[PDB]
Enzyme design. Structure first.
Site, short mmCIF file in Angstrom:
data_model
loop_
_atom_site.label_atom_id
_atom_site.label_comp_id
_atom_site.label_asym_id
_atom_site.label_seq_id
_atom_site.Cartn_x
_atom_site.Cartn_y
_atom_site.Cartn_z
CE1 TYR A 1 20.38 -6.69 102.30
CE2 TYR A 1 21.62 -6.05 104.31
CZ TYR A 1 21.56 -6.22 102.92
OH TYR A 1 22.64 -5.87 102.18
CE1 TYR B 1 25.83 -8.04 95.52
CE2 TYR B 1 24.78 -8.52 97.61
CZ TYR B 1 25.34 -7.60 96.72
OH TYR B 1 25.40 -6.25 97.01
CG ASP C 1 22.59 -5.39 98.78
OD1 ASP C 1 21.76 -5.26 99.70
OD2 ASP C 1 23.76 -5.83 98.97
N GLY D 1 19.50 -0.65 111.43
CA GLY D 1 18.17 -0.41 112.09
C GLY D 1 17.75 1.07 112.26
CG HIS E 1 18.44 -2.22 101.91
ND1 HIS E 1 19.54 -2.22 102.76
CD2 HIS E 1 18.74 -3.10 100.92
CE1 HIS E 1 20.47 -3.03 102.26
NE2 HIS E 1 20.01 -3.57 101.14
CG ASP E 2 16.69 -1.30 107.69
OD1 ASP E 2 16.46 -0.47 108.60
OD2 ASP E 2 17.82 -1.37 107.13
CE1 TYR F 1 12.27 3.98 109.46
CE2 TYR F 1 12.87 1.61 109.77
CZ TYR F 1 12.00 2.70 109.99
OH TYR F 1 10.82 2.56 110.69
N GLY G 1 21.59 3.16 107.76
CA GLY G 1 22.51 2.78 108.83
C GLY G 1 21.96 1.45 109.29
#
Length: 118
Positions: A52, A67, A92, A32, A48-49, A28, A30
């Site tokens: 998002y 941000y 993040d 996808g 994290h994926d 994971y 990178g």
């Protein structure tokens, strides 16, 4: 955005390794996005994926989001205003803190995701 997430990682982990290490790691870390995570670090990246993908589901575009945050003594600190920026900064922030806590196994870097992550 990408650069901010990079600086944020650096901040959290105290520059212990290049942020670029987290871009080719496990199933994971990178772009996808498949199979069972190879360890808890990789699971940081999976969460994290998901984060998002929740953001995009609700109209944010994490790759376009710049941000407001600061690297403080205690670590990264989100200081954003608009909804999307607050949301994406918080994705993040959780991944960077996660990376600071979890072990990095060099044997899990640069794995054959084609074969190991189905």
């Amino acid at each position: 955005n990408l650069v901010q997430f990079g600086k944020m990682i650096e901040c959290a982990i105290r520059n212990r390794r290049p942020a670029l290490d987290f871009m080719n790691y496990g199933c994971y870390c990178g772009k996808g996005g498949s199979g069972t995570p190879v360890d808890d670090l990789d699971r940081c990246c999976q969460v994290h994926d998901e984060c998002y993908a929740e953001a995009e589901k609700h109209g944010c575009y994490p790759s376009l989001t710049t941000y407001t945050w600061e690297c403080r003594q205690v670590g990264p600190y989100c200081n954003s205003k608009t909804q999307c920026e607050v949301f994406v900064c918080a994705c993040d922030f959780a991944a960077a803190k996660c990376f600071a806590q979890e072990d990095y196994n060099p044997a899990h870097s640069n794995i054959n995701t084609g074969e190991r992550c189905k």
